[PDB]
Symmetry: D2
Subunit: 380 residues, 4 copies
């Protein structure tokens, strides 16, 4: 057992699962077909208190601790990875508004983030730069009471639905070092000069509305600056600890789900007068998967505890992110293979789980970037 | 060492054909879920179908190296073209090896032209790896066989006009495998129906389907070889089947390596080509090494096979190891493209989805290891 | 941080390390040359309270909790794996006497186990059976007030020094199932018919006195029966949880030691105008080793906590044992390679660490047996 | 395909020789820390040293396949015999390729007989992988070179009567590698001393030592080739060096596989042979597969090498991949023997200790990947 969950979280998990059993599980395949999860689902999430529950009661939130977010994100992954946009809204983007927003900004935005009237996104990555974030070239040039924004952002989660987009841009492209010229600017829906691409066709996460964003002389009120000019990089580096933790949590859950699928399948499939689960190689493969899952679960649970205690754990979250995502990828490969021909059929859930997992090694920072961060912390 | 100048010239000419007839259309075929029969017709009229078939049926008496070239060049277009290799090098050889003079005359000419596309149906919902435990029955009611059963995952399952079906003509054979025969089932057989095109992770243009036999009336002269010797024919032909899969997986690995190398050489980050970071260099060096090992091994197996030698162990080794290697290449390739590796606009995404099934068909990699272990005594 | 260590354990670790810095570290290489650790070392351990510290004060012990044993075994491994005989005495064998001994037996044996006047060993494995323990063939036939013992035991840790040997033997060879015929019998030094082989030449653990034991009509007092006849297998299965945990702890420490050796080496070695630690492949290899070490440490620490709480964790300890031992083997292989030619030289400590590690995957139950146990617990 | 009947007959005869002169004595040699010169003498008198050397110096003009047979058969005895392969196929070829007519006449006859045992000294305490950064100097003081420096890890370091030493005859060469020459240093050179036999994890009968030069007086006619072209000679010869290592590692893998297979087939547990448990079967199938891949690859490299083709990439691939594979085989072998794998009475223990150094010498596996990456462009 992990110490961050108490009885209240256990009853919450059951209540949230009951909601999903009606609203998510039976609808998920249709959402994938359409390429997007309907706004009405977010509205239902908001009215039931499952959006931004950590937000203060004065904005309509529940003052919930981070364990509630762990439960939400785990239960949503149990449905499917296309639901990652909720965890992104809850635990990645809206915390920027709460941490760095003025009272006026928080009052204006947070209540609607809780209800789901405003859906959020964060836009860092550009065609020319992802891992090398200091090299982004989207510019925001001050002109009167406005920032004139020019640039392109790519692979944006919630790219179609998002009404509020936290945009990383260069307010001073000539700054030394380059990262000191970066600022965070909130871009609202229907901003003149702000357009969106058609939803991106991807290997998986088919129900996630990933899209490119285009800023052609985007006229953004100066009021929409989040925090201080030229400190944008610092806000990002700070919040990426929670971001990477969220990815680690979702990948751990995905592995657990895929293991359960495989175990159940091989226990019911017969070959050569035996259940497939009776062959020693199958037993050992499952034992090895179970072991690695136990390791990842124990580690991520410890990192959650450290995080909740307010401790700085850059190294450990980077470890959790790369290792658990690779582990879940290995689980997926084993799972497909152990299903035989059926693991390659879209009628079987494992096919979708398999297509969904490998991107976890790429986003929130590639696993190569995680190893880079670890090596830096090792002092070499 | 099995490729002579004639094969190099043929490769260039076949590639030119595909640059016109296949490469520009592949993405459309995938969207359609099938490769049009018109393409098969163009392949047939140009002599690219069953080239090994004797000239007397309209073939070219081509050696196996021509089939290697064709299958490799088709994979470089994409894995959904595996149906042609299956027609050419898996199924039609059953007709030539075990067909009567009369069956060969009736069927082989049209297989060369592509008027008849072939398929082979072994696997059932209840049994794949455990092939001896198939339950599809063919009961004589002269001069017909009455066939009952279901076959699953059939390549060319929609297009196929001739299907070689493994069935139990004596379900009480003891030992069970002794009751297996091969029966050719023709398009428009009464009681023979097909399922919808299967929705798969990849091979989107390959028409895989289930087949259904409900008191299907099959003429007794459609028996292939002798009653009760079907299992023996299958074990015999599975060596070339496994070789074909190994060749295609080897080619897929090479294609994916090339895509990845080109990408990382053009992509820059932190003031360098991605290909300049030492970890990327070593990963590419390791991929290049395993690719070279697979190429050398499969080439030697091809040579042995063409020499008429029994290669059961070696082909089983090639099949499992090369398919697993190709899978590892795919995983490296997606990762090294970053977000772009996950985008369907990039070819690597499709290559990635296509590869993992190679570890499953022609017999699972677990079955390959089972065979190797048996041969190790 | 792991919750089982308090300030008292931290001061204890420092005190114990101070003892070892004088008595163990500088002598270790000589012990390996001789093939045995001198009795005088055990005597020093006993007089300083470092043997069987968990034993009750009434037998001369300290009533120490298991965290003291964790510290002792970790610190001894930091010296070298040839010191495993101490952890075996402390935490594997003597607990059998405390758990299953009569008051008379405990009074007779435990005080001298604390002082080191009696060194203990456990003898299960035979030439014909190790993994398949139910198939042991050493017999003990009752004759008057004695058991007549015939058989051979192999690979016995503390095989030369041991004065008390807990011997698994068949008191009823015809029993059904075979395991119901197994009993534990304490064999004392100078028992008529009991002899020992020459110390076994091994790949590593060169200072550990591993030997075969021979029983040719060994005349053992019936008083020396430990527990109940035919329940021997049950005692063994019960105590193997702690045994496997001890092995996992030592392997985790060995990995940590080997990592430190490698990191320090590559940081000081120059090639191509750079420190070796500056090449990206070296950085990533170290980052990967660091990650896996962090996983093993977090997991074993959690298992220690569960164990100390009195919980039954057969699955988790089997996971810890196989995965950590394999991980430490991988660490060792990386460490040798990263030292270049120097990693193959016996003058460098890594050579010895490398030779010492791979046996951890074999003893206390092979890693194949660990996977067997896990699969059984998965219900397949 | 490089072995003809003559080579098969030779293999049998050489093995017979070793069954008498080597196998029964190997464990004793290991205890002694050296292979006696008497064995070298028996090898020489039977024509098993430098067989490729022209008949005019007393050699046999044997092709490289004879060296393959010798090195393989010696490894089947044990890895401490690598000094012979080093003499035959690594060092003496420097004398034949770059020696003047007069040096060849002076040295090659005695290398064939074994009167002179050879060694090559590249590596220094401060530089191994980074060979261009060697600091051993050879300064002309006609008609001598005055040599100062230290060489480390020298195979045949005790026995060697001739040592080919890489040194800087112009330490200000810019570019540095242009100042490297090869200088033959003879036994009993003034100022030339040797360290104690190095204590190693394995290769216990191989006499590895450090060499010390303190104003060593070396005759100028002991220069091998031209001044400042030493680096070029080394890069040229390292292809055969790396091939020799790959061959020995391949053979070690095969030996260890055979030991393991035999053990698990004779050992029983839980009412079955250990070899009957499915996980053991699959592990052995995987080992057999990788061994087959390595054998096929190294055999093809040997063929290419004998054809006189440049094989830099391929040999680097063979060296790193096969040594890593052999290491994996060793780890599997110890585990599958249980406790017995850890006992020095069992041959597998020694094989296990011997193998990992193959990933280090002839250039580290990291250097092999560096070379491959460079060739990938
Ligand atoms: C489904 C999905 C959703 C996404 N959502 C968002 C979002 O909501 N907001 C957002 O800002 N971004 C988002 N992204 C972008 C994602 O974070 C980036 O794809 C990721 O950071 C990698 O950047 P890149 O794609 O440009 O790859 P690159 O940075 O171009 O790297 C390509 C490859 O080179 C490797 N590489 C680069 N440098 C080195 C080096 N120094 N050493 C070794 N290897 C190196 C990388 O690890 C990678 O494997 C999303 C991506 C995906 C796939
Ligand atoms: C794209 C595609 C095309 C196909 N085309 C054809 C075709 O044209 N003709 C045809 O006849 N078939 C075809 N198939 C079927 C294919 O050959 C089978 O899927 C394959 O043989 C495995 O059979 P199965 O799917 O029933 O898996 P199963 O036999 O049920 O096995 C499932 C899993 O169980 C494991 N397993 C089973 N037995 C053992 C054992 N004893 N020990 C350890 N593990 C074991 C295997 O690891 C496997 O991963 C096709 C399949 C695919 C995916
Ligand atoms: C340094 C050292 C110290 C030791 N100290 C002691 C001691 O103090 N007391 C004591 O009692 N013993 C001791 N041992 C013995 C040790 O526990 C045994 O070696 C171990 O349990 C394995 O038994 P075995 O050597 O007989 O191998 P075996 O049981 O013969 O097994 C050989 C191989 O076959 C594999 N195998 C067996 N069955 C299966 C199966 N069903 N499926 C898959 N694989 C299988 C095993 O995993 C192993 O890899 C020691 C051993 C060593 C090396
Ligand atoms: C048994 C034995 C026999 C030998 N016999 C001979 C002989 O006869 N003649 C002779 O000349 N030499 C001999 N050697 C030397 C051997 O070739 C060297 O040990 C080897 O080349 C590596 O050099 P090094 O030991 O100095 O390691 P280093 O060059 O110091 O390298 C140590 C580690 O650093 C890493 N490294 C270095 N540079 C890089 C880089 N750029 N990128 C990533 N990693 C890097 C490598 O991974 C290596 O593992 C022998 C060695 C042994 C062990």
């Amino acid at each position: 057992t992990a110490r961050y969950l108490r009885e209240e979280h256990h009853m919450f998990r059951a209540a949230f699962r009951k909601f999903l059993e009606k609203e998510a599980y039976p609808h998920y395949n249709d959402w994938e077909k359409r390429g997007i999860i309907p706004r009405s689902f977010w509205a239902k999430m908001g009215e039931n208190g499952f959006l931004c529950p950590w937000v203060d009661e004065k904005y309509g939130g529940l003052n919930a601790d981070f364990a509630y977010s762990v439960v939400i994100n785990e239960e949503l992954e149990k449905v499917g990875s296309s639901l990652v946009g909720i965890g992104l809204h809850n635990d990645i983007v809206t915390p920027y508004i709460a941490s760095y927003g003025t009272e006026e900004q928080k009052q204006k935005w947070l209540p609607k983030c809780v209800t789901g009237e405003l859906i959020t996104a964060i836009a860092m990555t550009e065609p020319g730069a992802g891992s090398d974030l200091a090299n982004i070239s989207t510019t925001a040039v001050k002109d009167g009471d406005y920032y004139i924004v020019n640039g392109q952002k790519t692979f944006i989660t919630n790219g179609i639905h998002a009404d509020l987009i936290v945009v990383a841009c260069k307010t001073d492209p000539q700054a030394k070092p380059p990262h000191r010229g970066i600022s965070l600017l909130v871009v609202e829906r229907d901003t003149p000069g702000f357009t969106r691409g058609r939803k991106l066709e991807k290997v998986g996460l088919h129900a996630q509305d990933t899209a490119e964003l285009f800023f052609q002389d985007a006229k953004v009120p100066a009021y929409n600056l989040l925090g201080e000019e030229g400190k944008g990089f610092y806000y990002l580096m700070e919040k990426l600890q929670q971001e990477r933790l969220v990815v680690a949590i979702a990948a751990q859950t995905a592995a657990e789900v895929m293991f359960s699928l495989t175990k159940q399948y091989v226990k019911q499939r017969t070959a050569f007068g035996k259940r497939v689960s009776e062959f020693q190689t199958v037993q050992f493969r499952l034992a090895e998967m179970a072991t690695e899952i136990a390791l990842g679960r124990t580690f991520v649970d410890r990192v959650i505890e450290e995080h909740m205690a307010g401790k700085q754990i850059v190294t450990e979250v980077s470890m959790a992110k790369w290792w658990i995502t690779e582990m879940a990828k290995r689980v997926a490969a084993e799972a497909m293979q152990l299903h035989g021909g059926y693991g390659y059929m879209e009628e079987y859930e494992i096919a979708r789980r398999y297509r969904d997992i490998p991107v976890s090694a790429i986003y929130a920072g590639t696993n190569e970037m995680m190893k880079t961060i670890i090596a830096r912390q090792l002092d070499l």
